[PDB]
Amino acid sequence: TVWQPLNPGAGGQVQDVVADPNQANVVYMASDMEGVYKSTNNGESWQITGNLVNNRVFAVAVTPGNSNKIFVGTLYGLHISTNGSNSYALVPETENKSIASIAFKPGNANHIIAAPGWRDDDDFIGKFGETAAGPGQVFVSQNGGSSWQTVTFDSNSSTDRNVYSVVFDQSNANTVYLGSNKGVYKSTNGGLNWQRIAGPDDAVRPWNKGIALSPNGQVLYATYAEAKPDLRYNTNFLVYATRTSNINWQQVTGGLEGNRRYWYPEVDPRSTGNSHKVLLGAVKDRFGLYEGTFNWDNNGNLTNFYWEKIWDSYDGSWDIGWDYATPPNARFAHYTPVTGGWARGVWSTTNQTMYYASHNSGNNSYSWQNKYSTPTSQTVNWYGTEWPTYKGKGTESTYTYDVAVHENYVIQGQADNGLMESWDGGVSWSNMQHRRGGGFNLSDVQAVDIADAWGVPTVVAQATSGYGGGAHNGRLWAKRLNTHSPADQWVELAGGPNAKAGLPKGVLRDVAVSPANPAKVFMFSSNYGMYMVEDIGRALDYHDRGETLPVTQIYEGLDNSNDARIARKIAPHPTNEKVVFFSSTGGVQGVWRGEQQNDGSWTFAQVLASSGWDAEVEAWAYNGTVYLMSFAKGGGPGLTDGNNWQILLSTDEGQNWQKIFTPADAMAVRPTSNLVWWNSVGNRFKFTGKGGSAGAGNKIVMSYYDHDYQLGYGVFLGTIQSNGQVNWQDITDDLHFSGMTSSRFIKDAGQMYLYSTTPGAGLWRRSISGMNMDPA
Amino acid sequence: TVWQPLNPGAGGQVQDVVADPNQANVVYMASDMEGVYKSTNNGESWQITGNLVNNRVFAVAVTPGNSNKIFVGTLYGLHISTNGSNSYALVPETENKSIASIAFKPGNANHIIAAPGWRDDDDFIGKFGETAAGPGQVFVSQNGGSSWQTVTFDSNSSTDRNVYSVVFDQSNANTVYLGSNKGVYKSTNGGLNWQRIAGPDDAVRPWNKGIALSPNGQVLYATYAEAKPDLRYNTNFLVYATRTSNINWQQVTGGLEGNRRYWYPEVDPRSTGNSHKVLLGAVKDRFGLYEGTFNWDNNGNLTNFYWEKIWDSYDGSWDIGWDYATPPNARFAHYTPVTGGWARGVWSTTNQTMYYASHNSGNNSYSWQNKYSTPTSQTVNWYGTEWPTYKGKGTESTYTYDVAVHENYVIQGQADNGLMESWDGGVSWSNMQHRRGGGFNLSDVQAVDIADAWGVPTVVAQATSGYGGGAHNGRLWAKRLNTHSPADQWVELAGGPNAKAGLPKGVLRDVAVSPANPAKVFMFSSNYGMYMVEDIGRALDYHDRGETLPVTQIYEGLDNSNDARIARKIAPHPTNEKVVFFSSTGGVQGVWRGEQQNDGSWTFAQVLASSGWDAEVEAWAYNGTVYLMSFAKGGGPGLTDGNNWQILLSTDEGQNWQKIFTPADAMAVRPTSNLVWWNSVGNRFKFTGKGGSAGAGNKIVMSYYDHDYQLGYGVFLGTIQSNGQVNWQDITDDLHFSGMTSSRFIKDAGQMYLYSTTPGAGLWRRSISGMNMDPA
Ligand SMILES: [Cl-]
Ligand SMILES: [Cl-]
Ligand SMILES: [Zn+2]
Ligand SMILES: [Zn+2]
Ligand SMILES: [Zn+2]
Ligand SMILES: [Zn+2]
C-alpha cells in the first residue's frame, strides 16, 4: 500500500449491488467512476477489483455455478473475468456498446443474454459516439461467453433502444422477456427471435421502464412511461400486471404514492406459487422502498394486492450514515438469491450509498444496515441532535474539488456533498454542517484554504448550493478553528444570492490566502473580476456586530477581447503580498500577473499565453529562487504543441519560461504497457488534466487525465536538481483513479505528504521522500 | 417631496408586470391598492404614475408603436393615458365595468380588445354593484381607443362572465380567441362576432382559466376547471392542447404536480415553428413556475412534451428578499417581447413581489433577480441563518395597522406580513422573526406600543396568526430593546390559543401604554372586556422563570345592551394613570371613560354617544389643558350629522364636546377639484375613515377615507390657537394613498414628525412645522 485514502465512504451515485448466487455474503458494487468493488462479508468492508477499460459500470453478473467467471457491463461494453474479478478483458463483440443487463438461462449457465443499455445515464451515452436512438438489439452467447451473437428485435434506427431488464421464465427456461423503451418483447427460443408485447396504453405511455416475471412464468409486472427526452421531466410511471397466457394489462398502483418514477420491478425468487412479492423503487424520487404482495387465484384473477413501504424516511430505526439523504431514493433494489446459502434480504441504496436489510419472516419485518460507512465515537451537533463522524468501509466515489489541512482538521470541498469535514486527520468525517437553516444546502465547495483571523487559523471556502457541479453563485464562508472540533461553526462573509459585501454572484473558482500575509485572501468571481479581503479578522469583526465589511475589487474582468474573465487557480506570491498570479480560463486566457502599487492600485498583465479550462499556476520559494509553474495548453511560439498540456516553469516571475514536461516525457517515464485501456481507447486519449499540479520545495507533481473518458494516464513527481534540471518519476503506484483536481504538499506529524483530490474517488495522500523545504 | 415613505418594498398581492414592447427595460406593475408603477430600468427602481379613478388595477397594455399611449384596466373600468402614464382619463364606455385584459391586433395597433374581468378577485367584483354573473362581452375599438363597441359573445345573464385572456393569431391577425368561465370562444373577424369552442369535458370542467396560442396559430393551449363559486375550494385545473384546425383536446399534465390551479398559459412569441415554449403558473398554489416544451410534427401530431420547473423552492440560487415566500406562487408570468430590443426573459412573482429572470440560451438556464427590495449590509439571525435587512425599490403595498418608534427602532404592524421591524429608523426592514417555531406565523399585528420593563424600553404588540386580516386571537407579545438591534427577541406574555395569563381569545384591537406610568399596559379583548398589565417588568420576571403572571381584568363587556364589547383605540390619560378612555365599536358604542378607585376597583361609563367601526379617541396634555378628541360618527343631539364622521373635542374629559371639523370644512379647505375621481364616483363617497387621527401639543390630524372604494379625500392638520379655535390646513400634498389606519406625532432627531400608517400603502412620515410640546 502506497496511496492512502482519507474518505467517509461512497458518496457517489451507485448503479447496483449484485449478490453472488453461489456463495452467501459475496457481493459486487457497480460504481459509475471507479469500476467494481467486491466484498466477501456482505458489505462490512469493500475491496477494489481489477482494472476495466471503462469505469462507468451499469451491470455485474456472476456465473451460476462458477464464482470465478464474472461479467461486467460498462459504458464501453462488456468485460469478462475468469479469475473472480482479479483481472478483466474487454469482450470484442460489445466494444463501444454500453451494456446494462446480463442474464443467464435457468439451468444452463452457458446461455447468456447481455443487453445494450445505460440505466438513467442518458447524459453519458454519447461519450464514445453512441446514441440513444438505434435498432433494438441484444447479445446472446450459448458457450459461456467465448462468442456472442447480435440479435435484433426492432429495426427502427430513430427510436430509443435502452433496455432496462432481461428476465427468464424459471419454469420454462426457453421463454425470456425484455423491458425496453422500445417496448416489452418476448422470446420462446432463448432470445434468438423476439416478438413485441403491446403495452397497456401505447398511444400515451409506450416506454417500458423495467419488467418482472413470477417464477412460475404466469404473471408479468411492468411500469410504463410517456415518451420524453429527459427523465428529469418525466415524473409519472404507472405500474401494471398481466397474465402472460393472454396479454390484458391492469393498473395496480392502488396504495403507491402518485406521480413517481417507479422502475425496475422484481419478483422474489421465493414466490414460486400464486402469491408474488414485488420489489419496487424508482429513479430520482425519494420515498423509500416498496414491497408489493399480489395474490392470484388459479383462475388467473388477481384476488387482491397491496403495497407496503419496507423502507421509509429517517425515523431512528436505521443508521443513515454521514449522507443525510432522506427519504431514500431506492434507485436499485434486489432480493437475495435462494442459492449459495443466502438468507432472505434486500440490497438497496439511499442514492449514493449501500444498504442491506435482513428479514424476519415471523413478523415480516426488515432491519436496515449501513453498508457504506462506519460510525466512530466522535459526535457532531446539528439540528439539536448528536451525529457520529463516519469512516469509509472501503469505497470512495465523491467528486472532490479541493482540500485543506490544519493540525487535526481536514476539509475536502466536494460537489453534491459540500463541506466534508474531519477532526481526526481525515479518518472520519461529517458534512452535516452544510445543511443550513432556511432550506438551502452548501452542496458545492470548489475551493478551500486556511487564513489567519487575529492569530486564529480560519478556514475559508467557496461554498454554495447546486448539485452535479452546477454551482449557483460565488459565496465566501469562514470557520474560525477555535477548538479544531465540531463545535467550530461556519459564517458567511461575502457573495451569495444577496451580493453580500459587494461580492458579485460569479462563482469563485478558487480562493487563495497570501502566504506572506495569511490574513489577506484573494478570489476571482467568474465573469466579474478579482477581489480581495484585505484582512479577514476585520471582516469577522464587522460580521460579529451584525454588519458587513465590503470586499476590495483589485481587477475588473468584463471585456472578452482584452480582460481575463475567469480564473481556475490563484497563486499569491510566496513572500511579496503585493504580487499575485492566476490562470485565466475565460476571455484572454493564460497566466496573468498582478502587482499592487504604493497608492494601492493594481496593474495586471498576461505573462504566458496559455489556455485550458482547468489550467493551473503555482508560485513558491525554495533556496532563494521563486518558482512559477504552469500546467496548461499552449504557451506561444516555441512552447505550444497542439492541444497537449505541458508543465512550463519560470524562475523570473513569468518573463521567461522553459518546457520541463510533455506527453512524450510522460510516456517514456510511464510506458503505455501500464494501461489496460491503451489498445482499445488510447487513440481517443488526450493529454489534458482536471488540475492536480503543485510545487513546493524541490518537488513538483502533475497528473495527466482526460475527463471525457474518465481515463488517467499517471501521476508524475519531479525533483528539482542542484543545477536546475528536473528529474521525473512515476508515482502512480497503486492509485487506480489517478486524475486529480488538486494537489498540495503538506507536512503532517513531521513527515511530508502529497494530498491529492480526485474528480470521482475522493481524497488520497502519499508519503514523499527526500524533500527539502524552506523553513516557514 | 413632502411625504417620506419608510417601507421594505411591495408586500401586497401583485396583479401583473407588463413590458413595454417598444423599449427594453420599461415595465409597468399593476397593484391592487395604489394603481400603476412604472420603471425604466427593468425594475431596479419604481416610480408612481398618474392618478386613476380606481386603484385596483388588473391589466396594463402599452400601444405597439406608441409608448405614450397606455391603457389601464381597473375595477371601475378602462383608463387611457396619452402622455406615457403621467395622467389618466376614464374611458366612458367601460365606466363601472371591471377590465382585466387588453390586446392589440397584430400589425394594427388601432384595433384593440378590452375584456371584462377581475382575475381572482371575486371578493371585490361587487364593490361598485357589478356581479360575476352576466352576459359574456368584450369591448372592441378600431380607431385606437377613441371609441369602443360592445360585442356580446354569450347572452346567459346567470352564468359567470369573467374573461381571463384574449389572444390573437400572429399568422392571421383577424383570428382571435378568448378564454372565459363562459368557455373558450373564437372570432375570425377581429372580435366582432364570436363562436364557442367546446372544451375537453364540458359536463365536468366547463370553465376555462386562460388560453395560449402558438404564433403560427396552429395549436391552442388551455386549462379547464370544474364550476365552483370560490377559487379557495377549486384546486384541480387540468392542462390541455388541441390543434386549431380540428378541435380535439388532449390532456398534457404529465410531469406537472397534481391538483394545482394552473392558469394563464402563454406561448413564447419566439416559438414561431413547431416547438412551443409554454409558461405556466397558478393562482394561490406555491410550486414555483413551469416552462413546457411541446414538439409537434408537420402532421399535427404531438411527438412529445415535457414540463420543467424554471423556478422552484428557495435553495440559495436567488435572493428571496424580505418576504420569505417559498415556494413562489407565480400568480402571473410573462415572456419578454421580441420587439424594442428586449432580451429573452421572464417576469413573475412569489405572490406579493416582483421578479425577473434572465435567460442563458447556451444551457437553457434562468437567473432570478429580486426586483422589489434591496439588501443592506445589516443582518438578522433566524433559522440559524443570517438574512439581510431590505429597503424598498419604490413600491409599498402593505396593509399596515399601527406603528411604534424608539430611538433607531421602528415596527409597523401589518396584515399578512406581521412584525415588520427596522433598526435604521425605517429605511430597511426584516419580518423574519414573525415565523415562529412550531409552524405558526405572527402574520397579523394590529397594535404596537413602547412600554418600560424596569427601565428597559420594551415593545408590546398584539401579534397573532391569520392572513387577509383574519386575526385568530388576542395575543400579547413583548420585545425588550436591550440592544436596539436584531439580537432582541419576542416573548409571549398573554392570550393566544392557550389563554395564557388568563387573557381571553378576543382580538386586542388596540394595546396602549400609560404615559403616566409606562410600565402599565391596557388592552381590550373583543367581546370580553378591558384588561391591564399592571407592571410589565413583573410580568417578564415570571416569564423568565418559565411561569406566568395573570393579567388584571378591569372592565367586563359581555352585555350587548349595556356594556362596551369591542374597542378600536385606547387612550390612557396623559398624567393620571387611574383614568383611561376608549372608543367602543361594539355593544354600546361611543367614547367610554373609566376611573380607578382607591380599593383598585374601576367604574366605566359612556361620555360620548358616538359610533363607527374604526372610531378613535385620543387624550393628551398641552399647556395646562387635557384635550380629549374623538373621530367618529354621531355624538348625540346637536352633534350627530347623519353618517358623516366628524372631529369632536373636549377639554373637560368628555363631559362637554365641541364640533371642530366636518365634511363641509374639509371640502372648503380642500376643494373637490383636487380629486380626479369626484366627477365619476363622488356620489358614492362617504366621509368616514379607517382611523389615522391623532393629537399632540397644539396639533391635530385626521384623514377622510372610504374603504368601500379605496378613496381618500385628504389629510387635514389642525393648529390649536391661543384662544381655543383650531385652524385647519390641507397636508395631503404628495401623499397619493392618503387613507390612514393610525397616526402618531413623533420627534426624531430634534424634529417633530407625523408618522402615519395606511390601509394599503405602508408607512409614511411628514415634517410638521411650528409645533409646541409640553416637556416630557
Ligand atoms: Cl390501481
Ligand atoms: Cl398527460
Ligand atoms: Zn448515472
Ligand atoms: Zn484551491
Ligand atoms: Zn386580488
Ligand atoms: Zn394602536
Q: Are B590 and B608 in contact (CB under 8 A)?
A: yes
Q: Which three cell numbers stand for residue A465?
A: 448550493
Q: Are A501 and A525 in contact (CB under 8 A)?
A: no
Of B317, B375, B388, the CB nearest to A472: B317
What does the DSSP assignment read for B140-198? EESSTTSS-EEEEEE--TTSB--EEEEEEETTEEEEEEEEETTEEEEESSTTSS-EEEP
Q: Which amino acid is at B560?
A: N
Q: Give yes or no for a cis peptide into A8 (omega within 30° of 0).
A: no
Which residue's entry shows cell 375621481? B677
Contact A438 B255 (CB under 8 A): no
Q: How many whole angstroms separate alpha carbon B680 and alpha carbon B88?
A: 13
Q: What is the CA radius of gyration of chain B?
A: 28
Q: Which three cell numbers stand for residue B628?
A: 380629549
Helix, strand, coil percent values for chain B (each to nearest 5): 5, 50, 45
How big is the CA angle at B318 (ends B312 and B321), to the nearest 5 degrees? 105
Give counts: helices (H), strands (E), chain A. Answer: 3, 58
Q: How many whole angstroms separate alpha carbon A602 and alpha carbon A593?
A: 10
Q: Are B742 and B413 in contact (CB under 8 A)?
A: no
What does the DSSP assignment read for B719-734? EE-TTS-EEEEE--TT
Residue of A nearest to B377 (CA): A548
Q: How many whole angstroms separate alpha carbon B411 and alpha carbon B429?
A: 9
Ligand 6 centre to CA of B448 (Å) is 6
Task: Give strand ranges (E) for A588-731.
Answer: 590-596, 602-622, 625-635, 645-650, 658-661, 694-696, 699-706, 711-720, 726-730
Q: Are A70 and A80 in contact (CB under 8 A)?
A: yes
Residue of B nearest to A489 (CA): B384
Which residue's entry shows cell 401623499? B735
Backbone angles phi, psi at A669, to 5 degrees: -75, -35
Q: Which three cell numbers stand for residue A452?
A: 489567519
Return binding residues of B.
Answer: 13, 121, 402, 510, 541, 556, 559, 563
Q: How many whole angstroms separate alpha carbon A222 and alpha carbon A240?
A: 5
Residues B619, B620, B626, B629, CA torsion sign: negative
Sheet architecture: strand order including B490-495 = B444-453, B456-464, B475-480, B490-495
Q: Are A247 and A202 in contact (CB under 8 A)?
A: no
Q: How many whole angstroms separate alpha carbon B113 and alpha carbon B106?
A: 12
What DSSP element (H or E) covers B666? helix B663-669
Distance from CA of B610 to the nearest CA of A (A): 49
Q: How many whole angstroms separate alpha carbon B525 and alpha carbon B775?
A: 33
Contact B304 A466 (CB under 8 A): no
CA A70 to chain centre: 24
Q: Which amino acid is at A756?
A: S
Distance from CA of B247 to the nearest CA of A (A): 19
Of B255, B314, B486, the CB nearest to A233: B255
Biggest distance spanned by C-alpha atoms of chain A: 94
Q: How many whole angstroms separate alpha carbon B466 and alpha carbon B33?
A: 20
Which residue's entry shows cell 408603477? B37
- Name, in order, each residue with C-beta under 8 angstroms of A220's C-beta and a sequence gap of 6 or more: A177, A184, A197, A211, A212, A213, A214, A241, A242, A243, A244
Residue A458 backbone zone (phi > 0: left; psi -120 to 50: alpha; other: beta):
beta
Of A229, A472, A546, the CB nearest to B304: A229
Q: Are A451 and A521 in contact (CB under 8 A)?
A: yes
Distance from CA of B314 to the nearest CA of A (A): 7
- Name, in order, each residue with C-beta under 8 angstroms of B635's C-beta and a sequence gap of 6 or more: B608, B609, B610, B646, B648, B657, B659
Question: How many residues can be counted in chain A?
Answer: 776
Contact A233 B306 (CB under 8 A): yes
Q: How many whole angstroms separate alpha carbon B100 and alpha carbon B85?
A: 18
Residues closing a segment before a gap in chain B (C–N exceeding 2.5 Å)? none
Chain A residues with CB within 8 Å of chain B CB: 226-230, 232-236, 258-259, 436-442, 464-466, 472-473, 475, 491-492, 496-501, 543, 546-548, 550
Q: Which three cell numbers stand for residue B219?
A: 395549436
Q: Which three cell numbers stand for residue A93?
A: 463483440
Ligand 4 centre to CA of A582 (Å) is 11
How big is the CA angle at A73 (ends A70 and A76), to the nearest 5 degrees? 130
Q: How many whole angstroms separate alpha carbon B172 and alpha carbon B107?
A: 10
Contact A547 B385 (CB under 8 A): no
- Name, in order, each residue with C-beta under 8 angstroms of B92's C-beta and a sequence gap of 6 or more: none
Angstrom CA distances, B306 to A689, B561, B644, stand at 36, 65, 60
Contact A500 B375 (CB under 8 A): yes
- Name, in order, each residue with C-beta under 8 angstroms of B356's C-beta and a sequence gap of 6 or more: B42, B43, B345, B346, B347, B348, B368, B369, B371
Ligand 4 centre to CA of A744 (Å) is 9
Q: Which amino acid is at B203?
A: A
Q: Which amino acid is at B619?
A: A
Q: Which three cell numbers stand for residue B278?
A: 409554454
Task: Give strand ranges (E) for B496-624.
Answer: 508-513, 521-525, 529-533, 552-556, 564-572, 579-587, 590-596, 602-622
Q: How many whole angstroms separate alpha carbon A262 and alpha carbon A278?
A: 12
Backbone angles phi, psi at B680, to 5 degrees: -90, -40
Q: Are A413 and A401 in contact (CB under 8 A)?
A: yes
Residue B232's SS3 state is: helix
Ligand 6 centre to CA of B710 (Å) is 22
**Taking CB atoms and an 8 Å cutoff, what residues of chain A touch B386?**
491-492
Q: Which residue from B65, B70, B64 is spatially nearest to B83, judged by alpha carbons?
A: B70
Q: Which three cell numbers stand for residue A483?
A: 477548538
Q: Which three cell numbers stand for residue B501?
A: 395569563
CA A207 to chain centre: 28
What does the DSSP assignment read for B612-624? EEEEEEEEEEETT
CB-facing half-sphere around the CA of B492: CA atoms within 13 A = 20
Ligand 2 centre to CA of B255 (Å) is 8
Q: Which three cell numbers stand for residue A558?
A: 468584463
Burial B505-522 (b: 16+ CB within 10 A, else e): bbbbbbbbbbbebbbbbb
Q: Which residue from A294, A343, A428 is spatially nearest to A7, judged by alpha carbons?
A: A428
Q: How many whole angstroms separate alpha carbon B163 and alpha carbon B154?
A: 12
Q: Which residue from A499, A562, A492 is spatially nearest to A525, judged by alpha carbons?
A: A499
Q: Which residues surround ligand 3, an ion (CB under 5 A)?
A: A 121
Q: Which amino acid is at A230?
A: D
Q: Which three cell numbers stand for residue B389?
A: 435587512
Of B316, B377, B385, the CB nearest to A548: B377
Residue B39's SS3 state is: strand
Residue of B nearest to A507 (CA): B317
Q: Are B656 and B648 in contact (CB under 8 A)?
A: no
Contact B385 A436 (CB under 8 A): yes
Contact A472 B315 (CB under 8 A): yes
Instruction: Provide the β-strand partners of residue A572.
Output: A580
Q: How many whole angstroms separate alpha carbon B715 and alpha carbon B691?
A: 11
Q: How many CB atoms neighbour CB A249 within 10 A?
A: 18
CB-facing half-sphere around the CA of A410: CA atoms within 13 A = 28
Which residue's entry shows cell 491503451? A678
Distance from CA of A495 to the nearest CA of B (A): 11
CA A495 to chain centre: 27
Q: Are A101 and A179 in contact (CB under 8 A)?
A: no
Contact A547 B377 (CB under 8 A): yes
DSSP class of B415:
T
Please classify residue B361 by burial: count the beta carbons closer than 10 Å to its beta carbon, then call 0-12 exposed, 13-18 middle and 19+ buried: exposed
Q: Which residue from A21, A24, A100 is spatially nearest to A63, judged by alpha carbons?
A: A21
Q: Which three cell numbers stand for residue A110?
A: 452457458
Q: Are B366 and B343 in contact (CB under 8 A)?
A: no
Q: Which three cell numbers stand for residue B719?
A: 393648529
Q: How many whole angstroms separate alpha carbon A308 and alpha carbon A254?
A: 11
Instruction: Provide the β-strand partners of residue B405.
Output: B410
Contact B254 A232 (CB under 8 A): no
Q: Which residue from B424, B389, B420, B357 is spatially nearest to A498, judged by alpha carbons?
A: B389
Instruction: Provide the β-strand partners of residue B691.
Output: none
What does the DSSP assignment read for B352-394? SS-EEEEEETTTTEEEEEE-SEEEEEEEEEETTEEEEEEEESS
Question: How many residues can be counted in chain B?
Answer: 776
Q: How many whole angstroms separate alpha carbon A188 and alpha carbon B370?
A: 62
How big is the CA angle at A410 (ends A404 and A415), to the nearest 5 degrees? 70
DSSP class of B505:
S
- Name, in order, each residue with C-beta under 8 angstroms of B73's C-beta and a sequence gap of 6 or more: B57, B58, B59, B60, B61, B79, B98, B99, B100, B101, B102, B114, B117
Q: How many whole angstroms separate alpha carbon B452 and alpha carbon A88?
A: 81
Contact B317 A473 (CB under 8 A): yes
Q: Are B716 and B674 in contact (CB under 8 A)?
A: no
Ligand 2 centre to CA of B250 (Å) is 8
Q: Which residue from B382, B379, B374, B377 is spatially nearest to B432, judged by alpha carbons?
A: B382
Task: Give strand ranges (E) for A454-551.
Answer: 456-464, 475-480, 490-495, 508-513, 521-525, 529-533
Contact A547 B485 (CB under 8 A): no
Q: Are A49 and A32 in contact (CB under 8 A)?
A: no
How big is the CA angle at A326 (ends A321 and A331), to the nearest 5 degrees? 95
Q: Are A454 and A544 in contact (CB under 8 A)?
A: no
DSSP class of B288:
B
Q: Are B113 and B176 in contact (CB under 8 A)?
A: yes
Contact A546 B487 (CB under 8 A): yes
Residues B202, B208, B212, B213, CA torsion sign: positive
**Taking CB atoms and an 8 Å cutoff, what residues of chain A touch B383?**
437-438
Residue A364's SS3 state is: coil
Q: How many whole angstroms separate alpha carbon B155 and alpha carbon A29?
A: 70
Backbone angles phi, psi at A14, to 5 degrees: -95, 130
Inter-chain Cβ pairs, chain A and chain B, closer than 8 A? 93
CB-facing half-sphere around the CA of A180: CA atoms within 13 A = 32
Q: Which three cell numbers stand for residue B281?
A: 403558473
Q: Which three cell numbers stand for residue B330?
A: 407565480
Q: How many whole angstroms separate alpha carbon B293 and alpha carbon B366?
A: 15
**Taking CB atoms and an 8 Å cutoff, what residues of chain A touch B308?**
232-233
CB-facing half-sphere around the CA of B738: CA atoms within 13 A = 25
Q: Which three cell numbers stand for residue B541?
A: 420576571
Of A235, A437, A466, the CB nearest to B385: A437
PDB resolution in Å: 2.2
Q: Which residue from B280, B340, B283, B342 is spatially nearest to B311, judged by alpha carbons?
A: B280
Q: How many whole angstroms separate alpha carbon A291 and alpha carbon B487?
A: 51
Q: Which amino acid is at A654?
A: G
Helix, strand, coil percent values for chain A (each to nearest 5): 5, 50, 45
CB-facing half-sphere around the CA of A547: CA atoms within 13 A = 9
What DSSP element (H or E) covers B117? none
Instruction: State which approach was used to obtain the coordinates.
Output: X-ray
**Taking CB atoms and an 8 Å cutoff, what residues of chain A touch B291?**
none
Q: How many CB atoms neighbour CB A222 within 10 A?
A: 29
Contact B379 A548 (CB under 8 A): yes
What DSSP element (H or E) covers A543? helix A536-544
How big is the CA angle at B694 (ends B689 and B700), to the nearest 5 degrees? 105
DSSP class of A10:
B
Residue B238's SS3 state is: strand
Task: Give strand ranges (E) for A135-248.
Answer: 136-141, 149-154, 163-169, 172-180, 183-187, 195-197, 207-213, 219-225, 238-243
Q: Give yes or no for a cis peptide into B375 (omega within 30° of 0).
A: no
Q: Are A70 and A27 in contact (CB under 8 A)?
A: no
Q: Are A538 and A552 in contact (CB under 8 A)?
A: no
Residue B41's SS3 state is: coil
Q: Which residue from A15, A18, A19 is spatially nearest to A33, judged by alpha carbons?
A: A15
Angstrom CA distances, A436 to A268, A390, A424, A465, B436, stand at 41, 20, 24, 10, 17
Annotate B486-499 with three-state secondary structure.
Answer: CCCCEEEEEECCCC
Q: Which three cell numbers stand for residue B376?
A: 443592506
**Considering every ligand atom, which ligand is closest to the CA of B33?**
5
Q: Are B525 and B506 in contact (CB under 8 A)?
A: yes
Q: Are A41 and A51 in contact (CB under 8 A)?
A: no
Q: Are B534 and B521 in contact (CB under 8 A)?
A: no
Q: How many whole angstroms separate alpha carbon A287 and alpha carbon A282?
A: 9
Q: Which three cell numbers stand for residue A673?
A: 504497457
